[PDB]
Design an enzyme around this catalytic site. Structure first.
Site, PDB file in Angstrom:
ATOM      1  N   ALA A   1       0.825  -1.203   0.000  1.00 36.56           N
ATOM      2  CA  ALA A   1       0.000   0.000   0.000  1.00 36.56           C
ATOM      3  C   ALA A   1       0.862   1.256   0.000  1.00 36.56           C
ATOM      4  CB  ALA A   1      -0.933  -0.013   1.208  1.00 36.56           C
TER       5      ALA A   1
ATOM      6  N   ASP B   1       9.503  -6.174  -5.828  1.00 33.49           N
ATOM      7  CA  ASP B   1       8.568  -6.871  -4.956  1.00 33.49           C
ATOM      8  C   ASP B   1       8.337  -8.260  -5.525  1.00 33.49           C
ATOM      9  OD1 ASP B   1       6.466  -7.884  -3.454  1.00 33.49           O
ATOM     10  OD2 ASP B   1       5.521  -5.928  -3.209  1.00 33.49           O
TER      11      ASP B   1
ATOM     12  N   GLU C   1      -3.501 -10.223  -4.198  1.00 34.12           N
ATOM     13  CA  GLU C   1      -4.572 -11.024  -3.626  1.00 34.12           C
ATOM     14  C   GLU C   1      -5.831 -10.178  -3.505  1.00 34.12           C
ATOM     15  OE1 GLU C   1      -3.187 -12.545   0.069  1.00 34.12           O
ATOM     16  OE2 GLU C   1      -1.714 -13.898  -0.836  1.00 34.12           O
TER      17      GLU C   1
ATOM     18  N   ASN D   1      -5.834  -7.421  -0.769  1.00 31.43           N
ATOM     19  CA  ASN D   1      -4.969  -6.274  -1.002  1.00 31.43           C
ATOM     20  C   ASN D   1      -5.668  -5.152  -1.754  1.00 31.43           C
ATOM     21  OD1 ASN D   1      -2.525  -8.764  -1.735  1.00 31.43           O
ATOM     22  ND2 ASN D   1      -2.795  -7.694   0.216  1.00 31.43           N
TER      23      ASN D   1
ATOM     24  N   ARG E   1      -6.846  -1.443   0.117  1.00 36.57           N
ATOM     25  CA  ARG E   1      -6.017  -0.285   0.415  1.00 36.57           C
ATOM     26  C   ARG E   1      -4.939  -0.028  -0.627  1.00 36.57           C
ATOM     27  NH1 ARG E   1      -4.668  -4.618   3.001  1.00 36.57           N
ATOM     28  NH2 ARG E   1      -2.485  -5.231   3.297  1.00 36.57           N
TER      29      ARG E   1
ATOM     30  N   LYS F   1       2.981  -7.597  -8.246  1.00 37.48           N
ATOM     31  CA  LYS F   1       2.651  -6.242  -7.818  1.00 37.48           C
ATOM     32  C   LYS F   1       3.480  -5.199  -8.557  1.00 37.48           C
ATOM     33  CE  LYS F   1       0.953  -7.217  -3.169  1.00 37.48           C
ATOM     34  NZ  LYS F   1       1.119  -6.905  -1.729  1.00 37.48           N
TER      35      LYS F   1
ATOM     36  N   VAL G   1      14.598  -8.608  -1.687  1.00 38.48           N
ATOM     37  CA  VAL G   1      15.807  -7.919  -1.252  1.00 38.48           C
ATOM     38  C   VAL G   1      16.379  -8.679  -0.061  1.00 38.48           C
ATOM     39  CG1 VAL G   1      16.747  -5.823  -0.256  1.00 38.48           C
ATOM     40  CG2 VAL G   1      15.127  -5.688  -2.141  1.00 38.48           C
TER      41      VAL G   1
ATOM     42  N   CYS H   1       6.077 -24.988  28.528  1.00 40.17           N
ATOM     43  CA  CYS H   1       5.283 -25.706  29.520  1.00 40.17           C
ATOM     44  C   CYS H   1       3.872 -25.149  29.625  1.00 40.17           C
ATOM     45  CB  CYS H   1       5.969 -25.656  30.884  1.00 40.17           C
ATOM     46  SG  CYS H   1       6.764 -24.083  31.272  1.00 40.17           S
TER      47      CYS H   1
HETATM   48  N1  LIG Z   1      12.310  -8.728   1.742  1.00 34.13           N
HETATM   49  C1  LIG Z   1      11.423  -8.179   0.906  1.00 34.13           C
HETATM   50  N2  LIG Z   1      11.840  -7.812  -0.324  1.00 34.13           N
HETATM   51  C2  LIG Z   1      10.961  -7.264  -1.165  1.00 34.13           C
HETATM   52  N3  LIG Z   1       9.666  -7.009  -0.969  1.00 34.13           N
HETATM   53  C3  LIG Z   1       9.280  -7.383   0.254  1.00 34.13           C
HETATM   54  C4  LIG Z   1      10.070  -7.962   1.231  1.00 34.13           C
HETATM   55  N4  LIG Z   1       9.330  -8.214   2.376  1.00 34.13           N
HETATM   56  C5  LIG Z   1       8.129  -7.788   2.068  1.00 34.13           C
HETATM   57  N5  LIG Z   1       8.026  -7.271   0.805  1.00 34.13           N
HETATM   58  C6  LIG Z   1       6.836  -6.729   0.162  1.00 34.13           C
HETATM   59  O1  LIG Z   1       6.438  -5.602   0.900  1.00 34.13           O
HETATM   60  C7  LIG Z   1       5.031  -5.376   0.664  1.00 34.13           C
HETATM   61  C8  LIG Z   1       4.392  -5.143   2.006  1.00 34.13           C
HETATM   62  O2  LIG Z   1       3.056  -4.641   1.787  1.00 34.13           O
HETATM   63  P1  LIG Z   1       1.832  -5.155   2.641  1.00 34.13           P
HETATM   64  O3  LIG Z   1       2.334  -5.661   3.990  1.00 34.13           O
HETATM   65  O4  LIG Z   1       0.797  -4.107   2.721  1.00 34.13           O
HETATM   66  O5  LIG Z   1       1.324  -6.421   1.829  1.00 34.13           O
HETATM   67  P2  LIG Z   1       1.080  -7.967   2.123  1.00 34.13           P
HETATM   68  O6  LIG Z   1       2.088  -8.389   3.189  1.00 34.13           O
HETATM   69  O7  LIG Z   1       1.074  -8.777   0.892  1.00 34.13           O
HETATM   70  O8  LIG Z   1      -0.344  -7.944   2.811  1.00 34.13           O
HETATM   71  P3  LIG Z   1      -1.030  -8.318   4.197  1.00 34.13           P
HETATM   72  O9  LIG Z   1       0.075  -8.119   5.235  1.00 34.13           O
HETATM   73  O10 LIG Z   1      -2.098  -7.248   4.395  1.00 34.13           O
HETATM   74  O11 LIG Z   1      -1.573  -9.704   4.155  1.00 34.13           O
HETATM   75  C9  LIG Z   1       4.511  -6.675   0.042  1.00 34.13           C
HETATM   76  O12 LIG Z   1       4.506  -6.470  -1.364  1.00 34.13           O
HETATM   77  C10 LIG Z   1       5.647  -7.664   0.297  1.00 34.13           C
HETATM   78  O13 LIG Z   1       5.711  -8.483  -0.859  1.00 34.13           O
HETATM   79 MG   LIG Z   2       0.642 -10.631   0.042  1.00 34.34          MG
END
Ligand SMILES: Nc1ncnc2c1ncn2[C@@H]1O[C@H](COP(=O)(O)OP(=O)(O)OP(=O)(O)O)[C@@H](O)[C@H]1O
Ligand SMILES: [Mg+2]
Ligand SMILES: [Mg+2]
EC number: 6.2.1.45
Lengths: 147, 985
Positions: free
Chosen positions: B424, B450, B455, B458, B461, B474, B500, B580
């Protein structure tokens, strides 16, 4: 993290723990293999117990994962080696050294805590039939903790 | 009827009743510029009944400065008519309409009325009607780097929840006859004075279990007072208390009455004399517009500034304001009157949308009443801002040029940013960059990475995605959408699908990281944030971190050689329950949920993995017999899942589910009660099952009960999925099969050579040979919360509720079970908009290259209470090394690929320090306490060869540097910290 771990390692090297000997596995600073000698005033006398320590990335802000390797017949230790130690689950604070953890585990081996056990059958045997508990502990500490 | 598949994250913030009341409310929005469209977007994503737009003004080019639903092909068309079509696609449950003309009586059709870009006389005319008719009225305005919000919900607004926190609940140790209630050992109630609590499951004082709220008088962190309980009893033992929240009545004043005597809300305490200035300044803006045919003062014009200041003086005299007008700040407001920034629009739109949700749902504490905000610290100082540079050029960036000028526009257009994540916050950041014109020049570029897929949940927002995009990546969708918004970003955006981490250094290496200008994190986990922070610290790049949690949010800026890094601060860790507690003595629903998750993993995931590994690895048995902690467990699992209990139909799966019900809810409890009976005592004489330990009771399988049937259905379905059989849901087959079941006898057991090894071998030989089963694999069950047809959350809920019935814990529904088991983080669109606005307001500071640390502002906010705060970043700690000033974080040693001995001698000579420890990554390259033979073998080796030898892994061809951590002592023997070493390969 690495600097604190090396300071602890140097402290162990400078001052021998006598009853303990911890060190990194191979050359990895986040995986240690420690040794504990069975207390004399305990059923585990004359035994060597090996423990695996996994330091977290956020050390010392997170507790190290300490797991037994040698089989032990103790109310607070299950078959997988997990230890019911308060300072390793949620009471952990960035002020406790590995020597303190080993000393605490040695004290735990000195006297178990059946009031809040992890293996209920062993705690029941300990509370009801003390002699049978002693015999079983000696049998286990001779079958597994020796050789 | 709420679609929990779409509003899954929002319902954890608002609730079912709040959204039910929200889906019956009409919202009218006057003005469809950037602020209006932001408010409308957030409201449509929220889920109100309908949204009506009113803006008959034709589109102009400068209106594109913050309106992302307008294109250059829409010049000359009313803004509402070209915005409704694009707004109608955000949410399918929220129709969007347009009204050509607005009458006063028409206002009776709506629940909330939002007013933007409207004169003060029309605002007074609208509010004089919407006040007496009990219609919520919100008025917002955005002038350059200044913003104003006004809320008026009527004189008898009822606010049920005033802080948004969950009701306080806790377990009691003892209650005295004087009302003194004490918590358990080392347990804090957290109550405040004047609260009301209700007691349940209290022993010794049944009268407290009626539910009548009682006053709370806090006497300490662990004990409080409730009053007199003399009549009900003498002393109460144990029990659970729950806070009761009473509605509050808030009385607002109309716009006409509040113009004379406003009530301000201060977003920052360092400047509390400004809101009185802004109150006069905005009214002067309205008067100037009324006196010049609706024309705001020209950008950076001195004559208009003087006229505006004369209007300000006249207004201050008229309203009897005894405040000395600040000429500089007022003229600054005059200069930026024609500004239109996307960051301010996003920030104010998020805030105003939250206010609309408060008005509709009667939840959270609203603004009362005026909220004046400014971000004047973002105005550039390294470029020329004058009337000549700020004059409009007839382009879509006029609204931003009118504030920053053309030179700063050229500075922005040549940025090379790197955005990590496309959630978001990532989508909002991309929208803001597209509107601002970031990386539209010859040397500009944007990179977004990303690895997740879109989904259904998602779409609530993340407005750049559509239901037709579910299942796609994404980054690609976001890049395409933002290229559609700003066509100049065609070919300036590169999208990766890489996570990353340590494994991506071949792509995001030195070459990639040396061309960047700044890095923006949009992640949701701490490990990735720490990794990106370390990479930025090593490469010395500015970093912009931002996080949200429900209605709370924070933004932080990391500047090289100026402030501290992200990892210098520590956050509270996650709470893990003792083993425990989970295994034998649970007392809360979270313990049973954790136990149910562990049971799911151990029933449907681990044994399947063991069976698959046995049939694939030709030498699995020998390795397991000497490597696994419990080889007997592995052998038993293999035997049971291959030969002993291999189902041949779904009826056998039902029988297996019944057997597991007996195993986990009837027999283990019997064994536990055999070990520790209900009347047993501890070693100190106290009863064992007292306090945090609750006496369990075995469950007898009743088919008519709902929980038992749900567990049977879920377990049988999951077992059939493991064996790939045809599952069924009709109760008739379950009732027919389970009718003829004979429970095997079970009695608790007291207990009382290599024969065991021989028995293990006996099991070993009984297993079918791997060659007999080729191509046969069992499907493991991978946990997936978001899908409701996989019987994962159903099984976890059923098991948790059954174990709660064992220990007399109150069972929870599937909603709370999904929240707890899945680690779902509550999320909102308004919080995302606010954090994006703050981050983009810090980005312009970063671009300008501001040097002072007081010019940057880390931000925190909580929209449930209307709290905003901004604090200066913490400076990087300094240190003294060899009588020199060294930055702890942003300094390093640059050395060639010299041998270990040469490195030690260099540190001995140059820094005058003796090296005692040297490590690279997680391996200890050199230590002072190592035996002499090992050192003599390792000393004459180069650093790269030493690392390759110790780590037993060749360096990759793309590796160009080594980061070494060194601990060294001074000559006197005192330990002195030093910055890390950068060996150049
Ligand atoms: N190590 C990473 N490298 C790259 N992108 C990442 C990494 N960790 C998380 N992301 C991305 O960061 C974004 C986080 O956005 P957001 O948490 O809103 O989405 P989501 O985790 O898919 O959704 P939700 O938590 O609501 O189920 C997601 O696209 C996730 O793929
Ligand atoms: Mg997701
Ligand atoms: Mg997430």
């Amino acid at each position: 993290a690495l600097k604190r771990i090396n300071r602890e390692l140097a402290d162990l090297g400078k001052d021998p723990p006598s009853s303990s000997s911890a060190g990194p596995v191979g050359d990895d600073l986040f995986h240690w293999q420690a040794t504990i000698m069975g207390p004399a005033d305990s059923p585990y006398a004359g035994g060597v117990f090996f423990l695996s320590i996994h330091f977290p990335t956020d050390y010392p802000f997170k507790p190290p994962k300490v797991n037994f390797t040698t089989r032990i017949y103790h109310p607070n230790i299950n078959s997988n080696g997990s230890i019911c130690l308060d300072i390793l689950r949620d009471q952990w604070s960035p002020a406790l050294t590995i020597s303190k953890v080993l000393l605490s585990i040695s004290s735990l081996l000195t006297d178990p805590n059946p009031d809040d056990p992890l293996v209920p059958e062993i705690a029941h045997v300990y509370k009801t039939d003390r002699s049978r508990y002693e015999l079983s502990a000696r049998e286990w500490t001779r079958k597994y903790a020796i050789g | 009827t709420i679609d929990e598949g779409l509003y899954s994250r929002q319902l954890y913030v608002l609730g079912h009743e709040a959204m039910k009341q929200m889906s019956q409310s009409n919202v009218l929005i006057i003005g469809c510029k950037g602020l209006g469209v932001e408010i409308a977007k957030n409201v449509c994503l929220a889920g109100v009944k309908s949204v009506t737009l009113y803006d008959p003004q034709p589109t102009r080019i400068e209106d594109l400065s913050s309106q992302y639903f307008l294109t250059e092909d829409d010049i000359g068309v009313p803004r509402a008519k070209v915005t409704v079509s694009k707004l109608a696609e955000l949410n399918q449950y929220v129709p969007v309409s347009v009204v050509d003309e607005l009458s006063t009586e028409y206002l009776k059709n709506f629940k909330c009325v939002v007013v933007t870009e409207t004169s003060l006389t029309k605002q007074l005319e609208i509010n004089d009607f919407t006040h007496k008719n009990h219609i919520a009225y919100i008025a917002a305005d955005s002038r350059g780097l200044f913003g104003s919000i006004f809320c008026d919900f009527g004189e008898n607004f009822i606010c049920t929840d005033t802080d948004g926190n969950e009701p306080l609940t806790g377990m009691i140790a003892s209650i005295t006859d004087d009302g003194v209630v004490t918590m358990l050992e080392e347990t804090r109630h957290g109550l405040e004075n004047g609260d009301f609590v209700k007691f349940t499951e209290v022993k010794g004082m049944p009268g407290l279990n009626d539910g009548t709220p009682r006053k709370v008088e806090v006497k300490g962190p662990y004990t409080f007072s409730i009053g007199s309980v003399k009549d009900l009893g003498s002393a109460g033992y144990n029990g659970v208390f729950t806070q009761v929240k009473v509605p509050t009545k808030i009385s607002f004043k109309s716009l006409r009455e509040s113009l004379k005597d406003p009530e301000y809300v201060y977003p920052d305490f360092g400047k509390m004399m400004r809101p009185p200035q802004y109150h006069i300044a905005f009214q002067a803006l309205s008067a100037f517009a009324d006196a010049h045919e609706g024309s705001l003062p020209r950008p950076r014009n001195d004559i208009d500034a003087a006229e505006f200041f004369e209007f300000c003086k006249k207004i201050a005299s008229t309203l009897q304001f005894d405040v000395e007008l600040d000429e500089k700040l007022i003229k600054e407001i005059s200069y930026q009157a024609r500004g239109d920034l996307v960051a301010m629009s996003a920030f104010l739109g998020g805030a105003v949308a939250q206010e609309v949700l408060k008005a509709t749902t009667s939840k959270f504490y609203p603004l009362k009443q005026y909220f004046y905000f400014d971000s004047l610290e973002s105005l550039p100082s390294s470029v020329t801002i004058s009337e000549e540079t700020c004059k409009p050029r007839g382009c879509r960036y006029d609204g931003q040029i009118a504030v920053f000028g053309s030179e700063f526009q050229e500075k922005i257009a040549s940025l090379s940013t790197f955005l990590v994540g496309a959630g978001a916050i990532g989508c909002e950041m991309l929208k803001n960059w597209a509107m601002m014109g970031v990386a539209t020049g010859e040397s500009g570029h944007i990179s977004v990475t990303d690895m997740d897929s879109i989904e259904k949940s998602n779409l609530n927002r993340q407005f750049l995605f559509r239901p037709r995009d579910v299942g796609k990546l994404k980054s690609e969708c976001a890049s395409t959408a933002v290229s559609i918004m700003n066509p100049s970003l065609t070919g300036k955006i590169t999208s990766y699908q890489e996570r990353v981490g340590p494994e991506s250094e071949g792509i995001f290496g030195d070459e990639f990281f040396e061309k960047l200008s700044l890095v923006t994190n949009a992640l949701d986990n701490v490990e990735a944030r720490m990794y990106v922070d370390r990479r930025c610290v090593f490469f010395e790049k500015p970093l912009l971190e931002s996080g949200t949690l429900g209605t709370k949010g924070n933004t932080q800026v990391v500047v090289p050689h100026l402030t501290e890094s992200y990892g210098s601060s520590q956050d509270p860790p996650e709470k893990s329950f003792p083993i425990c507690t989970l295994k034998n003595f649970p007392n809360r629903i979270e313990h049973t949920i954790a136990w149910a998750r562990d049971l799911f993993e151990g029933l449907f995931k681990q044994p399947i993995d063991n069976v698959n590994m046995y049939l694939s690895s030709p030498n699995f048995l020998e390795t397991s017999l000497k490597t696994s902690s419990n080889p007997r467990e592995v052998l038993e699992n293999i035997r049971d899942y291959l030969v002993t209990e291999k189902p041949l139909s779904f009826e056998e799966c039902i029988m297996w589910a019944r057997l597991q019900f007996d195993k986990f809810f009837n027999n283990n409890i019997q064994q536990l009660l055999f070990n520790f009976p209900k009347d047993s005592v501890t070693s100190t004489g106290q009863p064992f099952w007292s306090g945090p330990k609750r006496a369990p009771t075995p469950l007898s399988f009743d088919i008519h009960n709902r929980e038992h049937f749900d567990f049977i259905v879920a377990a049988a379905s999951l077992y059939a999925f493991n064996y790939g059989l045809k599952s069924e849901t009709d109760p008739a087959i379950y009732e027919r099969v389970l009718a003829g079941y004979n429970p095997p006898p079970f009695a608790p057991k007291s207990g009382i050579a290599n024969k065991d090894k021989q028995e293990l071998k006996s099991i070993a030989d009984s297993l079918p040979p791997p060659s007999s089963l080729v191509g046969f694999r069992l499907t493991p069950a991978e946990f997936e919360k978001d899908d409701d047809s996989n019987h994962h959350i159903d099984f976890i809920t059923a098991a948790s509720n059954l174990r709660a019935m064992n220990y007399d814990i109150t069972p929870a529904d599937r909603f709370k079970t999904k929240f707890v088991a899945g680690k779902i983080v509550p999320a909102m669109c308004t919080s995302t908009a606010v954090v994006s606005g703050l981050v983009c307001l810090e980005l312009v500071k970063l671009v300008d290259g501001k040097k002072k640390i007081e010019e940057y502002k880390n931000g925190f906010f909580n929209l449930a209470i209307g709290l905003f705060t901004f604090s200066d970043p913490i400076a990087s700690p300094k240190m003294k090394v060899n009588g020199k000033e060294i930055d702890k974080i942003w300094d390093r040693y640059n050395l060639p690929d010299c041998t270990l001995q040469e490195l030690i001698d260099y540190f001995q000579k140059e820094e005058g320090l003796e090296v005692t420890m040297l490590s690279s990554g997680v391996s200890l390259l050199y230590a002072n306490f190592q035996p002499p033979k090992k050192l003599a073998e390792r000393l004459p080796l180069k650093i790269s060869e030493l690392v390759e030898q110790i780590t037993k892994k060749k360096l990759e061809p793309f590796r160009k540097h080594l980061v070494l951590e060194i601990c060294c002592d001074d000559a006197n023997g005192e330990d002195v910290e030093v910055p890390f070493i950068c060996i150049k390969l």
